[model samples]
Target: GTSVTLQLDDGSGRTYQLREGSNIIGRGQDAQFRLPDTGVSRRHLEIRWDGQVALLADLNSTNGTTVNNAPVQEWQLADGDVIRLGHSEIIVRMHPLT
Candidate 1:
């Protein structure tokens, strides 16, 4: 049972946990995390995990996505990777369940 933790930097001290699969982050109602900011696109970004590792991709977003301040179309995520969308930011952590 692997998991990914998303810690938001919106000063709300909010966090979310996701299982291994596709997780969408955006302003849309169907998004896993619906960020209602003006800079956030309807389907801003996506995160996918396969138990061992996770990948992050920008879904042709208006504001774009970045990993550690560098823009990327896709990126392999690590434990301490930082993902940014619009004016929001999330710190990703990988956990390996025993």
Candidate 2:
């Protein structure tokens, strides 16, 4: 199976492990990756893995989601892709996970 590693580039150096199925990223309590940035919405974006590829979608947040500085509504994330969720930056790492 495939997994994702989201590494925060905000100097805190936070990293999150994303498994198969839905993974939420937001400033809310239920988010899998709950960021404390002010620009983020309570329910921001979603990442889903179908074992082959990872899919991304913005949940119509206040600031929106960006990949490599470009705003994305629906995107297929690749290895080493740089993501901007709100004001925070994250690096996406794609790899095999068992």
Candidate 3:
């Protein structure tokens, strides 16, 4: 098994988890994480994982999504990639289930 963890910088010290499949990030109530930030869109971004690899994509968001300071339409996430959306910053890490 594999998973992706998102640690937010909102000082809540909370972590969002994404397993294999599609995970949506946004402000809407139905979203995986309802991040109600002004800079965040209703359906901001999407993260998809296929067991061993993870891919991030901006869902035509207003402000956009970035990885390590550079905006990207779709990005293949690494171990220590920092993903920025709206006013929130999240540290993404990949883990292997033991």
Clashing pairs in 2: none
Candidate 3 lDDT, 1-98, residue by residue in tens? 87789889788967898867888999888788678698999999998988888889999999999999999999999989998999998998878888
Give the TM-score of each candidate: 0.91, 0.92, 0.93
Model 3, runs deviating above 4 Å: none
Task: Indicate which candidate wins on TM-score.
Answer: 3
Q: In model 2, which regions exceed 4 Å deviation?
A: none
Superposed by TM-score, candidate 3 places the C-alpha of residue 27 at a distance from the truth, in angstroms, of 0.8
Best by lDDT: 2
Q: Tens-digit lDDT track for model 1 on 28-66?
A: 998887786889899898888788778888999988999
Superposition error at 14 for model 3 (Å): 1.6
lDDT of 2 by residue, 28-93 (tens): 999999999989988899988887788989998888899988899989999999989878999999
Candidate 1 residue 72 Cα shift, in angstroms, is 0.6
Candidate 1 ranges with C-alpha deviation above 4 Å? none
**RMSD after CA superposition, every candidate:** 1.3, 1.2, 1.1
Q: What's the true lDDT of residue 16 in model 1?
A: 77
**Better model by TM-score, 1 or 3?**
3
In model 3, where is the ten-residue run with the lowest total lDDT? Answer: 13-22
TM-score, prediction 3: 0.93
